[PDB]
């Protein structure tokens, strides 16, 4: 009796305007449309803002970030696979 019917739908109006300098060309149209979530476009802004936050020194002290505990991986005793596993080994950052 009180729930918004379209709160969980992500449906928003699309507006398209056409204008080519002549009165016969001007036309506005509006149709509802589901707004999708781009998986790829968020990654670039996430990486760039993470790099910016990693380089900012004054946000480093005013916003002390929290430690994240690593995932469980079994140790094998030999240190070459304990400290430098193949998922990481020989990776190093280019600065351009």
């Amino acid at each position: 009796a009180k729930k918004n019917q379209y709160m969980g739908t992500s449906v928003a109006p699309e507006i398209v305007l056409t204008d080519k300098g002549s009165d016969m060309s001007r036309k506005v149209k509006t149709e509802d449309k589901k707004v999708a979530a781009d998986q790829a476009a968020a990654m670039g802004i996430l990486a760039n803002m993470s790099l910016y936050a990693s380089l900012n020194p004054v946000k480093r002290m005013t916003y002390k970030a929290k430690e994240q505990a690593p995932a469980y991986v079994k140790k094998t005793g030999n240190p070459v696979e304990d400290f430098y596993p193949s998922s990481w080994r020989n990776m190093a950052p280019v600065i351009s």
Partner: protein
């Protein structure tokens, strides 16, 4: 009344909408980088895309409400109980209000054609009434959540 000022104001927003959204969320991260810290709720890949989608939906609705000249559809569709849904999911409301104010600044920059990164070609006149109207419309969505 007059549409040639109104339709220009809508067209000055719906064209460069994606840059406004992507600049608003990146500025919101740019103030506090806790949301992209592991443990923030924009940290994962699925979350920041949803945040982008929500910002674009808010911009979609306020651009439609500026065209319609009223805010009734804006409070029927979007703001009908958004704040407690952000509470129930768990959403830092102050940062979303901050992103809304960033989008509000960008919209009134684009309407007055005083944007200092890009220039539109317009006619001669004053669109400040539409600027105050869209400022009020952004204050609606800024006050409907808290």
């Amino acid at each position: 009344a007059d549409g040639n000022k109104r339709l220009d104001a809508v067209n000055s927003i719906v064209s460069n909408a994606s840059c406004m959204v992507s600049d608003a969320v990146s500025g919101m991260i740019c103030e506090n980088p806790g949301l992209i810290s592991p443990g923030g709720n924009c940290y994962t890949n699925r979350r920041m895309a949803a945040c982008l989608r929500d910002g674009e939906i808010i911009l979609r609705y306020v651009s439609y409400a500026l065209l319609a000249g009223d805010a009734s559809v804006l409070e029927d569709r979007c703001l009908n109980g958004l704040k407690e849904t952000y509470i129930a999911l768990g959403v830092p409301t102050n940062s979303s209000i901050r992103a809304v104010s960033i989008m509000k600044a960008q919209a009134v920059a684009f309407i007055t054609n005083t944007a200092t990164e890009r220039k539109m070609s317009f006619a001669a006149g004053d669109c400040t009434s539409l600027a105050s109207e869209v400022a009020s419309y952004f204050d609606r969505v800024g006050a409907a959540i808290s």
